[PDB]
Amino acid sequence: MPGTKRFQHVIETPEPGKWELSGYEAAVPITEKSNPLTQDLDKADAENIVRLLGQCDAEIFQEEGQSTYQRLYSESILTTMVQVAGKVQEVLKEPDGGLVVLSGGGTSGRMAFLMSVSFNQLMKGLGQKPLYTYLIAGGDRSVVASREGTEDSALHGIEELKKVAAGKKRVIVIGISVGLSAPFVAGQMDCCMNNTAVFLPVLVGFNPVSMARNDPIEDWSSTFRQVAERMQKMQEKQKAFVLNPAIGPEGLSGSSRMKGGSATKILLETLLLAAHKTVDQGIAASQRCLLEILRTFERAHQVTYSQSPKIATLMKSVSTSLEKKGHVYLVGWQTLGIIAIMDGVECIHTFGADFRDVRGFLIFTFSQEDFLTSILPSLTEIDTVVFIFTLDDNLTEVQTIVEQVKEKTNHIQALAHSTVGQTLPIPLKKLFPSIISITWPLLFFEYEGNFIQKFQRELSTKWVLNTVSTGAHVLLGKILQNHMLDLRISNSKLFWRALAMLQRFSGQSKARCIESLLRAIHFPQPLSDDIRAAPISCHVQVAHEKEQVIPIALLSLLFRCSITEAQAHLAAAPSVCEAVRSALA
Ligand SMILES: O=S(=O)(N[C@H](c1ccccc1)c1cc2ccccc2o1)c1ccc2c(c1)OCCCO2
Ligand SMILES: O=P(O)(O)OC[C@@H](O)[C@@H](O)[C@H](O)[C@@H](O)CO
Secondary structure (H helix, E strand, O other), X not given: OOOOHHHOOOOOOOOOOOOOOOOHHHHOOHHHOOOHHHOOOOOOOHHHHHHHHHHHHHOOOOOOOOOOOOOOOOHHHHHHHHHHHHHHHHHHHOOOOEEEEEEEOHHHHHHHHHHHHHHHHHHHHOOOOOOEEEEEOOOHHHHHOOOHHHHHOHHHHHHHHHHHOOOOOEEEEEEEOOOOOOHHHHHHHHHHXXXXXXXXXXXXXXOOHXXXXXXXXXXXXXOHHHHHHHHHHHHOOOOOEEEOOOOOOOOOOXXXXXXXHHHHHHHHHHHHHHHHHHHHOOOOOOHHHXXXXXXXXXXXXXXXXXXXXXHHHHHHHHHHHHHOOXXXXXXXXXXXHHHHHHHHHHHHHHHOOOOOOEEEEEOOOOOHHHHHHHOHHHOOOOOEEEEEEEXXXXXXXXXXXXXXXXXXXXXXXXXXXXXXXXXXXXXXHHOOOOOEEXXXXXXXXXXXXXXXXXXXXXXXXXXXXXXXXXXXXHHOOOOEOOEOOOOOOOOHHHHHHHHHHHHHHHOOOHHHHHHHHHHHHHOOOOOOHHHHHOOHHHHHHHHOOOOOHHHHHHHHHHOOOOHHHHHHHHHOOOOHHHHHHHHHO
């Protein structure tokens, strides 16, 4: 019947109690799974939220058990990392005509960007010409914008890759997709494989290839799964690589900006730095050079979450200011400013939040007086301002800007990174009562700009900010168990996540979930055979423009009622979250 093909890949909803014996659950990609540790995230207080997320984050470093998924520390992964270092090196030895591309959509593209800069700094620092570039879905503007719609075109990925790959002779394309999901990346990998004289593709993500997306890509003939399966075959001859450890599910189901983004840095910085230090030593990269770096990153989780109580506090003050319709500001210097801005933007699509609700600033790029004159005026008793810097920063810029803000608001808080035995100028010190200071041991660093110190701090800040922004919103009751029910459908992945969530929370059939979703999307238009047969992009484009789509679909199912009825029931309830919560009961 119409819509049969569009929806063929969808698994049937399991009967009550057999979620598993169906094999529905064994098919849920790890990156889409519910994390058992957070099944009551919607009840944890600030302190537990920090603990549960710090624990989810810990799973990146957890080793493989004995019939189960390879992980970061597994020998198959580390060995692939070695052989990939190997190949970066070949390009490091012939810079002329050589290029290294790091590419993803959304947070994967964001991660790509940071790391491209870093490794270009390192090559510059040695007086060599920078060989790194990034690519992000929607172009460069996406790096600091919520633009969830642009990951959906394979042609567009291939375009940008063709652009940047100019008249280069040797090109390493590291396609980064956490879910092994983004059509943007799928197209690049496939293009690399049709020209391995020039291209070497390395696919990075955190699902088994058996769980990679297998739904049709609208501008492309093969699926992500097929693309990845073919890369895996080429790996035996070292012409493609698939680097895909399991890190376990996200604490907020499907929120791959968290662990997936963190693991992406951890994995690739490790690997790239190894390749660099070892080319200079004229020695092959080895599992042992990778491990040193991996273990430093693992200390970095420990170090970072040593400050949990102060993390939970800042969480409370972020959450308060948002429950009172105030705003939260994130002010930080160099690369940590950038990470600040990434976190705030991501709250827009992740939580349905205003750009002003949690916003980031670099000293978006608003310098000292500029920020003092324009942003500083608009503050308020209930707002929160957050300062994020190292002690190698312009601490005279810092204390000034804090001085002004202190009058306009008292809920200030800071996150400061020091090597041991650096001290905080006593003015600054007096301005913060419980400060989140994170002090790092000394480590022997090979290069000019201490790139290993940079990676530790960026990562630790990411964890802190992610855990804060995410927990702030959970506290406001806006998450259901460990799902964001009320998301904006802005791409095909998110369409599938909505449909899966409808099956999960209603328990009702596939066909009914699909119908209720399309009805809620296209209302006031009824279901026609055209709509049923439409490509998924048509549904996304209409759904993107609307509110409460998923809650309305779910009410419809729960009350076995029409869209008209569900909408009017929603409007006659204190809140979305109450309407849904009470219908589920
Ligand atoms: O397009 S799919 O091949 N893959 C997506 C996916 C794969 C890899 C990374 C992210 C997302 C997906 C597959 C999938 C299977 C079970 C439950 C949720 C699911 O989400 C797909 C496969 C099966 C699906 C489904 C979608 O829609 C939701 C309901 C379950 O049936
Ligand atoms: O890396 P993927 O699986 O291809 O995901 C790419 C993007 O959808 C993803 O990063 C999204 O922007 C984030 O909001 C997920 O929290």
